[PDB]
Design an enzyme around this catalytic site. Structure first.
Site, PDB file in Angstrom:
ATOM      1  N   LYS A  39      15.945 -19.264 -46.424  1.00 29.15           N
ATOM      2  CA  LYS A  39      15.196 -18.612 -47.510  1.00 29.15           C
ATOM      3  C   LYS A  39      15.850 -17.289 -47.939  1.00 29.15           C
ATOM      4  O   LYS A  39      15.738 -16.885 -49.110  1.00 29.15           O
ATOM      5  CB  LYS A  39      13.752 -18.369 -47.094  1.00 29.15           C
ATOM      6  CG  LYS A  39      12.833 -18.058 -48.246  1.00 29.15           C
ATOM      7  CD  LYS A  39      11.390 -18.076 -47.764  1.00 29.15           C
ATOM      8  CE  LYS A  39      10.458 -17.567 -48.817  1.00 29.15           C
ATOM      9  NZ  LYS A  39       9.059 -17.714 -48.404  1.00 29.15           N
ATOM     10  N   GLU A  99       3.506 -16.587 -53.632  1.00 25.25           N
ATOM     11  CA  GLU A  99       2.843 -16.511 -52.338  1.00 25.25           C
ATOM     12  C   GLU A  99       1.585 -15.635 -52.361  1.00 25.25           C
ATOM     13  O   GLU A  99       0.528 -16.110 -51.927  1.00 25.25           O
ATOM     14  CB  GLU A  99       3.819 -16.058 -51.251  1.00 25.25           C
ATOM     15  CG  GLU A  99       4.791 -17.144 -50.878  1.00 25.25           C
ATOM     16  CD  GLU A  99       6.034 -16.682 -50.144  1.00 25.25           C
ATOM     17  OE1 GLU A  99       6.072 -15.514 -49.686  1.00 25.25           O
ATOM     18  OE2 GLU A  99       6.974 -17.500 -50.023  1.00 25.25           O
ATOM     19  N   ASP A 151       1.025  -9.108 -46.497  1.00 29.90           N
ATOM     20  CA  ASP A 151       1.692 -10.242 -45.861  1.00 29.90           C
ATOM     21  C   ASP A 151       2.779  -9.799 -44.875  1.00 29.90           C
ATOM     22  O   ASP A 151       3.868  -9.427 -45.295  1.00 29.90           O
ATOM     23  CB  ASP A 151       2.290 -11.166 -46.935  1.00 29.90           C
ATOM     24  CG  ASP A 151       2.821 -12.506 -46.445  1.00 29.90           C
ATOM     25  OD1 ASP A 151       2.963 -12.692 -45.200  1.00 29.90           O
ATOM     26  OD2 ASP A 151       3.093 -13.381 -47.297  1.00 29.90           O
ATOM     27  N   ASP A 193       3.807 -24.075 -47.964  1.00 32.19           N
ATOM     28  CA  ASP A 193       4.293 -22.725 -47.841  1.00 32.19           C
ATOM     29  C   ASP A 193       5.644 -22.915 -47.156  1.00 32.19           C
ATOM     30  O   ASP A 193       5.672 -23.248 -45.970  1.00 32.19           O
ATOM     31  CB  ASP A 193       3.378 -21.838 -46.975  1.00 32.19           C
ATOM     32  CG  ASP A 193       4.000 -20.523 -46.447  1.00 32.19           C
ATOM     33  OD1 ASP A 193       5.001 -20.045 -47.036  1.00 32.19           O
ATOM     34  OD2 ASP A 193       3.488 -19.979 -45.453  1.00 32.19           O
TER      35      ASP A 193
HETATM   36  N1  LIG Z   1      -1.320 -13.994 -32.231  1.00 34.52           N
HETATM   37  C1  LIG Z   1      -0.290 -13.330 -32.778  1.00 34.52           C
HETATM   38  N2  LIG Z   1      -0.055 -12.013 -32.557  1.00 34.52           N
HETATM   39  C2  LIG Z   1       1.037 -11.371 -33.044  1.00 34.52           C
HETATM   40  N3  LIG Z   1       1.979 -11.993 -33.763  1.00 34.52           N
HETATM   41  C3  LIG Z   1       1.836 -13.325 -34.049  1.00 34.52           C
HETATM   42  C4  LIG Z   1       0.679 -14.086 -33.565  1.00 34.52           C
HETATM   43  N4  LIG Z   1       0.804 -15.358 -33.990  1.00 34.52           N
HETATM   44  C5  LIG Z   1       1.949 -15.412 -34.723  1.00 34.52           C
HETATM   45  N5  LIG Z   1       2.541 -14.202 -34.755  1.00 34.52           N
HETATM   46  C6  LIG Z   1       3.823 -13.830 -35.363  1.00 34.52           C
HETATM   47  O1  LIG Z   1       3.875 -14.236 -36.702  1.00 34.52           O
HETATM   48  C7  LIG Z   1       5.233 -14.360 -37.099  1.00 34.52           C
HETATM   49  C8  LIG Z   1       5.381 -15.592 -37.972  1.00 34.52           C
HETATM   50  O2  LIG Z   1       4.420 -15.467 -39.002  1.00 34.52           O
HETATM   51  P1  LIG Z   1       4.345 -16.562 -40.165  1.00 34.52           P
HETATM   52  O3  LIG Z   1       3.378 -16.008 -41.198  1.00 34.52           O
HETATM   53  O4  LIG Z   1       4.153 -17.926 -39.622  1.00 34.52           O
HETATM   54  O5  LIG Z   1       5.913 -16.622 -40.542  1.00 34.52           O
HETATM   55  P2  LIG Z   1       6.604 -16.505 -41.975  1.00 34.52           P
HETATM   56  N6  LIG Z   1       7.200 -14.911 -42.285  1.00 34.52           N
HETATM   57  O6  LIG Z   1       7.820 -17.493 -41.976  1.00 34.52           O
HETATM   58  O7  LIG Z   1       5.656 -16.991 -43.006  1.00 34.52           O
HETATM   59  C9  LIG Z   1       6.027 -14.469 -35.798  1.00 34.52           C
HETATM   60  O8  LIG Z   1       6.740 -13.246 -35.621  1.00 34.52           O
HETATM   61  C10 LIG Z   1       4.981 -14.549 -34.710  1.00 34.52           C
HETATM   62  O9  LIG Z   1       5.357 -13.890 -33.486  1.00 34.52           O
END
Ligand SMILES: Nc1ncnc2c1ncn2[C@@H]1O[C@H](COP(=O)(O)OP(N)(=O)O)[C@@H](O)[C@H]1O
Length: 386
Positions: free
Chosen positions: A68, A173, A197, A7
């Protein structure tokens, strides 16, 4: 022979391997199951992943992220013009119209196309898998958003080739997330699947139909600028105002390094609030050598983000309208993206779907890599996950 699923995320990337019908999401050198899509250049080294994100506030000009958003785009696109306000690094247009990311590396000016930056993230994910397997990895399935056009898909494939990967396939995705849950196999009948998502920078809602192992993307909607980073910004804006009320009008926002350090702590508090009722935001010597401390309840975080959270249902209503279907006809709601861990978001989606429990068994920030890994194994001749 060995094929991985990657991913390649906006903010975070993830690598998985499917062997013997079981999917292992591979942790990096720091024990992290996801790796920041960050590439940094210093006077001595080229950092990728955690090491690059960790020094971003100390080296903003030479720390690249969000490639990206540029991959497969012409520099002149209105998307690029608008997004560039968010980047401390320099992006210029080349003679071919392609974006060129300009950084200083070892005291020299260097330029990179977005797919070269993405190839470095892909090379790091390839290496993460190689360290785990103890063997070279050549084949991979890389995922892209459903809305990516031919140019964006081809550039992502080129990033894979540059990284030394033989890209077996580029897949969507939302489709990868659905494959992860075995929704293509369990139940022969037609299934309407909603993928919700919400990552770090983007929000994508996709409505799929699955009839006889075949997934079709019927409708997509979302917001390319709604993600976790926007919820962090809500906490930052609040703390900036709170600092003013505590320290005779002093404005933290005037110092960009103070803002970055505050933002780092706001995201940590936000994550804590997904499993606790309270969290502390603390930055020692934030601005003018003044220490900053504040306690944020989950209720206050929910209040600051109230409109943004509720508005996530608007693209859900939009895909249902486009696909000409009622919310009662959705068989499965799959939560993808790290931000779907926020309790309020999960409650809002559940209430919208009249109490239907969303599929969230797979770590939402791993579901896409998990599905890509399944697809990589299938395309390699391994039918064990079926
Ligand atoms: N436990 C959690 N609660 C709230 N937000 C959370 C979290 N664990 C991760 N995140 C949030 O998820 C986001 C990243 O999500 P992810 O799904 O890895 O990123 P992406 N859009 O590059 O694919 C970040 O903003 C992070 O703060």
């Amino acid at each position: 022979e060995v094929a991985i699923g990657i991913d390649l995320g906006t903010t975070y990337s993830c690598v998985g391997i499917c062997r013997n019908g079981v999917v292992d999401i591979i942790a990096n050198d720091q024990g992290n199951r996801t790796t920041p899509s960050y590439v940094a250049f210093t006077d001595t080294e080229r950092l990728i992943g955690d090491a690059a994100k960790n020094q971003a506030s100390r080296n903003p000009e030479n720390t690249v992220f969000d490639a990206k958003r540029l991959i497969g785009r012409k520099f002149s696109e209105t998307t690029v013009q608008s997004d560039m306000k968010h980047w401390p690094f320099t992006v210029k247009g080349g003679s071919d119209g392609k974006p060129m990311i300009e950084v200083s590396y070892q005291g020299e000016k260097k330029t990179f196309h977005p797919e070269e930056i993405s190839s470095m993230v892909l090379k790091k994910m390839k290496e993460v898998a190689e360290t785990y397997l103890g063997k070279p990895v050549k084949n991979a399935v890389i995922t892209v958003p459903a809305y990516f056009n031919d140019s964006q898909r081809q550039a992502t494939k080129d990033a894979g080739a540059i990284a030394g990967l033989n890209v077996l396939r580029i897949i969507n995705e939302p489709t990868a997330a659905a494959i992860a849950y075995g929704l293509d196999k369990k139940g022969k009948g037609e299934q309407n699947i909603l993928i919700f998502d919400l990552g770090g920078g983007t929000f994508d809602v996709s409505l799929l139909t699955l009839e006889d192992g075949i997934f079709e993307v019927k409708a997509t909607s979302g917001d390319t600028h709604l993600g976790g980073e926007d919820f962090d910004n809500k906490l930052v804006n609040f703390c900036v105002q709170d600092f003013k009320k505590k320290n005779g009008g002093k404005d933290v926002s005037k110092n960009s390094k103070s803002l970055r350090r505050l933002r780092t702590q706001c995201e940590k508090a936000k994550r804590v609030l997904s499993s606790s009722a309270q969290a502390t935001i603390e930055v020692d010597s934030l601005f003018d050598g003044i220490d900053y401390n504040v306690n944020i309840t989950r209720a206050k975080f929910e209040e600051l983000c109230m409109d943004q959270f509720r508005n996530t249902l608007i693209p859900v209503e939009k895909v249902l309208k486009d696909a000409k279907m009622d919310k009662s006809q959705v068989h499965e709601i799959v939560l993808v993206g790290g931000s779907t861990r926020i309790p309020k978001i999960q409650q809002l989606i559940k209430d919208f779907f009249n109490g239907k429990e969303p599929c969230k068994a797979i770590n939402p920030d791993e579901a896409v890599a998990y599905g890509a890994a399944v697809q990589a194994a299938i395309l390699s001749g391994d039918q064990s996950s079926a």
